[PDB]
Amino acid sequence: SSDTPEGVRSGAGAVRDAGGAFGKKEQADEERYFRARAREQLAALKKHHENEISHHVKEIERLQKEIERHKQSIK
Amino acid sequence: SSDTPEGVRSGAGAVRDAGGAFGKKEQADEERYFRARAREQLAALKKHHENEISHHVKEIERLQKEIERHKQSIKKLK
């Protein structure tokens, strides 16, 4: 009874709207993934938080070389 | 006419006071020539060495402030 506007139809994202045993098979499945990516990315925050100083560091060295050029021009 | 005191005689500076074709051809030739001499006398006026040192530093100061910014960024991140 779906090929008619009078016959009722369903929405998008209604499986988790019921609250059955597929809505809790999916609410828990998402926590068993996005809890273990939360410590792949909590461990690599030691490195890249030092790398953003290393990039800044890189820039600093570059700018000091330019200064050096100007200082030699003056000389 | 001119071979007597009575007749009309021409003085000095009579091509510009007429304001014709030769009077306009003379004003645009004194300007298009002394425009290039405001180029060569201004380009060689930038060759003062004391200005280049001063400019060796303004730049240096600017760069040192950038470095200061980065150093503060690091301090924070650490």
Quick tags:
part of a larger assembly; 2 chains; 75 residues; mainly alpha; elongated; calmodulin binding (chain B); transit peptide (chain B)
What is shown here, in short?
The first copy, chain A, has 75 residues and is mainly alpha-helical.
Structure description:
The structure is cut from a larger assembly and holds 2 copies of chain A. Chain A has 3 helices and no strands. Chain A is mainly alpha-helical. Chain A has one domain (1-55). The N and C termini of chain A lie far apart (90 Å). At the A-B interface, helix 3 of A face helix 4 of B. The PDB classes it as membrane protein. Keywords: membrane protein.
Count structural domains of chain A.
Answer: 1
Helix % of chain A is 40-55%
Q: Radius of gyration of chain A from the CA trace? A: 29 Å
Number of helices of chain A: 3
Strand tally of chain A:
0
Strand content of chain A: under 5%
The outline of chain A comes out as elongated
Largest sheet of chain A: none
Biggest interface and residues each = A-B, 16 and 16 residues
Which structural class is indicated by helix and strand composition of chain A? mainly alpha
Give the N-to-C terminal Cα separation of chain A: 90 Å
H and E string of chain A: HHH
So what's the oligomer here? Answer: part of a larger assembly
PDB class: membrane protein
Keywords: membrane protein
Entry title: Cryo-EM structure of the mammalian ATP synthase tetramer bound with inhibitory protein IF1
Chains A, B: ATPase inhibitor, mitochondrial
